[PDB]
Amino acid sequence: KISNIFEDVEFCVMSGTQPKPDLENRIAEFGGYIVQNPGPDTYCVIAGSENIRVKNIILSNKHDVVKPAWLLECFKTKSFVPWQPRFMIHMCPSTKEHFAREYDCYGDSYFIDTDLNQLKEVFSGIKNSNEQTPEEMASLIADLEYRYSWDCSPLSMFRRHTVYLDSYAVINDLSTKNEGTRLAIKALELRFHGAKVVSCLAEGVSHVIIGEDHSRVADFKAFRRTFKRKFKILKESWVTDSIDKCELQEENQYLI
Amino acid sequence: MERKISRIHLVSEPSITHFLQVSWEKTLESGFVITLTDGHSAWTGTVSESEISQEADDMEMEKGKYVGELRKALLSGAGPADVYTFNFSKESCYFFFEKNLKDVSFRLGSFNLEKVENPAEVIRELICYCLDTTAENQAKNEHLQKENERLLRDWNDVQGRFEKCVSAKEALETDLYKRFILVLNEKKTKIRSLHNKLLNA
Amino acid sequence: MERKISRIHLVSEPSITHFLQVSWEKTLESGFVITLTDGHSAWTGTVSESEISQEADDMEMEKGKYVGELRKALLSDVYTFNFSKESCYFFFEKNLKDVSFRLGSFNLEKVENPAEVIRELICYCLDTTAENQAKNEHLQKENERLLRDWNDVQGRFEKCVSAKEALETDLYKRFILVLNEKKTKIRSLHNKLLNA
């Protein structure tokens, strides 16, 4: 019937059911053979979804398991499309090693420059993981900008600042929060340009930001005599003037 | 216990302003008291729940409707349309007021006023209440105008910041990509060179 | 034309309420008209630009805390008013802690309509009061509308900041995996070099 790129090529389809028998049927109208469990001549298994045979087929390493989107480019190109990482769910040892010569385990070449396209595609198979905390992401990010001189970028203008905004009628008392305030909007601006904003004044905050109420200024300067790391107190208009000229004004203008 | 001072003109007195003060508890329909004055004298009187009902009955007019008309006549509740007319004899002390529609005049109700004994004094009380009234509404205005300013400056300010932030965020992904590609392809320069030297090794 | 209205007492009649009303033209400094009433009778007085600043000269002083002492003392426990209907002399003096001294004193000259004067003054209140009520209503509905909008932009800016935070993290997370793979590769080859 419609082609035989697949003729004399044996396939196991384990998942499915994008549906397990649709694909076996389609394979079958490209000249190709189906087989209920894998064997010494089955070419690859096709893998729509995680599963019992599948999960298991991977745990042995005889076969090499490929996404359904591969067959669908073959069906669409009427051609026998060479395998590309983006296709592989799992690689059998021999094939793994053939592809570890040219490619990363995510699919980036060692030897050929990437691209917008090509890297989007790489990026595109991963979902993470959590293996990462906001505090953690921050430093990693921060050190990479430092490494690469991205640390003056606007959107990163404040990574290195850890800021307490005077948003609580009682310092550090979460239930005294003043809401719907020009200062609520300053927390958003600071965060949007990389700042770490903190609802607790404690050792390690580098900056505290006042607006128009100076009622707690003296508490702050009193707190700060007890700190080791001696935060600055700054006017709200610091943050605006920094963002408006797309780089840090700095601070001694804006003291206190 | 609401009151309501309203300035009028008598048909008898075209140019001279006159003041009507009504007073009640909170309906008008429950009855009300009703001083007139011109600066210089002062007349009073009382109307009652049922006198009102009778008056309406006389006019063959639905009661809400009628009280409608009373509030608008007596409380400065008048629409653009509405023309109301006020008539008083010092001499007979009779007060009546009417509405004027298709060039007819329609009497809306009447009063028996009783000229008042202490004139310069109720005037005093009256015009203390106005000072208090004007001062309250003044101060509330000063406050509302300041909030209006606050609010208008702060809305203008988030609107701009916000939109500048939506642009920057929408250009971010590609931007990161581009920084990532230059870094990875420099890495790959270094891979190639080491690999070739290993070939020649 | 400015103006200002003000309830007072006299020591001459301790137990009741009077009204002083001070009017002027574009400043208190041009000079001014001043009026007093019991609710019944009409008292007036014109003290203008030439003997206004001759006050602070025959006293040698800052017009400053004369002018400003008057306006405190006039335009509204411790000023003190005394007037007599026969002479028309009206004086006030600043009452201090255990001293006392003299501040001001129009030789008024009253007028003939005690009604025309009470008319302008009740009106003033009502006109000024009704004017504010209208504006206060509009301002109040304007301000609810400005707050609604403000609150909406706030919630949309909150989501845009979370989205920007999440977009970077996700994208750095997938970068550091790929970058790492270039450095490990660079390490083998470097080592494997040193060895061949």
Residues of A with CB under 8 A from a CB of B: 108-116, 119-120, 148, 150, 154-155, 182, 185, 189, 192, 243
C5 touches chain B (CB under 8 A): yes
**Distance from C-alpha of B178 to C-alpha of A212, rounded to nearest angstrom:** 41
C61 touches chain A (CB under 8 A): no
User: Resolution of the deposited coordinates, in angstroms?
Assistant: 2.4
**Distance from C-alpha of B183 to C-alpha of B196, rounded to nearest angstrom:** 21
E strand or H helix that includes residue B58? helix B49-58
Indicate the SS3 state at residue C83. Answer: strand
Nearest one of C152, B180, B157 to A243, comparing CA atoms: B157
| DSSP E strands, chain B | 3-10, 13-23, 31-37, 42-44, 46-48, 84-88, 94-100, 105-112, 114-115
Which distant-in-sequence residues (6+ apart) come within 8 Å of B6 by Cβ? B19, B20, B21, B22, B74, B75, B76
E strand or H helix that includes residue C150? helix C116-195
Nearest one of B13, A30, B139 to C132, comparing CA atoms: B139
C26 touches chain A (CB under 8 A): no
CA angle A131, B174, A250 (to 5 degrees): 80
Is A43 within 8 Å of A11 (Cβ atoms)?
Answer: yes
Q: Which two tokens stand for residue A29?
A: 């109208």
- Domains of chain A, start order: 9-111 (3.40.50.10190), 112-152 (6.10.250.520), 153-256 (3.40.50.10190)
E strand or H helix that includes residue C4? strand C2-8
| DSSP E strands, C15-160 | 18-25, 27-37, 42-46, 81-83, 89-92, 104-107
Contacts of A192 in chain B (CB under 8 A): 165, 168-169
Q: Which two tokens stand for residue A228?
A: 């080791």
Domain locations in chain B?
Answer: 1-118, 119-176
**Distance from C-alpha of B21 to C-alpha of B13, rounded to nearest angstrom:** 18
Q: Please count the residues of chain B.
A: 201
For residues A80-97, one letter each, b for 16 or more C-beta atoms within 10 angstroms of the residue's C-beta and e for the rest, the string is: ebebebebbbbbbeeeee
Q: How was this structure determined?
A: X-ray
Q: Which of residues 130-189 of C touch A (CB under 8 A)?
A: 147, 150-151, 154, 157-158, 160-161, 164-165, 168-174, 176-178, 181-182, 185
**Distance from C-alpha of A51 to C-alpha of A14, rounded to nearest angstrom:** 8
Out of B19, B147, B172, the one facing C167 most closely (by C-beta) is B172
**Distance from C-alpha of A91 to C-alpha of C165, rounded to nearest angstrom:** 35
**Distance from C-alpha of C58 to C-alpha of B14, rounded to nearest angstrom:** 50
CA distance C133 to chain A (A): 28
**Distance from C-alpha of B45 to C-alpha of C127, rounded to nearest angstrom:** 26
B119-176, what's its fold?
A: 1.20.5
**Look-up: residue for tokens 């905004």?**
A165
Bridge partners of C83, per DSSP, are C90
Is B28 within 8 Å of B34 (Cβ atoms)?
Answer: no
Instruction: Write out the DSSP string of B158-185.
Output: HHHHHHHHHHHHHHHHHHHHHHHHHHHH
SS3 annotation, chain A: CCCCCCCCCEEEEEECCCCHHHHHHHHHCCCCEECCCCCCCEEEEEECCCCHHHHHHHHCCCCCEECHHHHHHHHHHCCCCCCCHHHEEECCHHHHHHCCCCECCCCCECCCCCCHHHHHHHHCCCCCCCCCCHHHHHHHHHHHHHHHCCCCCHHHCCCCCEEEECCECCCCCHHHECCCCHHHHHHHHHHHCCCEEECCCCECECEEEECCCCCCHHHHHHHHHCCCCCCEEEECHHHHHHHHCCCCCCCCCCEC
Q: CATH classification of B1-118, choosing from 2.170.210.10, 1.20.1330.10, 2.60.40.1220, 3.40.50.300?
A: 2.170.210.10
* Chain A CA closest to residue C186: A110
Which distant-in-sequence residues (6+ apart) come within 8 Å of C167 by Cβ? B169, B172, B173
A contact chains, 3+ CB pairs < 8 A: B, C
* Chain B CA closest to residue C172: B176
Q: CATH for C1-113?
A: 2.170.210.10
Is B3 within 8 Å of B16 (Cβ atoms)?
Answer: no
Q: Which of residues 133-172 of C touch B (CB under 8 A)?
A: 133, 135-136, 139-140, 142-143, 146-147, 149-150, 153-154, 156-157, 160-161, 163-164, 167-168, 171-172
Q: What single-letter amino acid sits at C168?
A: E
Q: Which two tokens stand for residue B88?
A: 């008083």
* Chain C CA closest to residue A129: C173
C114-171, what's its fold?
A: 1.20.5
Which distant-in-sequence residues (6+ apart) come within 8 Å of A68 by Cβ? A18, A23, A46, A47, A48
In this complex, do A122 and C178 lie within 8 Å of one another by their Cβ atoms? Answer: yes
Q: Which two tokens stand for residue A191?
A: 């965060």
User: Best interface-test mutation with C: which of B155, B182, B195 has the largest number of C CBs within 10 A?
Assistant: B155
User: Best interface-test mutation with C: which of A185, A196, A243 has the largest number of C CBs within 10 A?
Assistant: A185
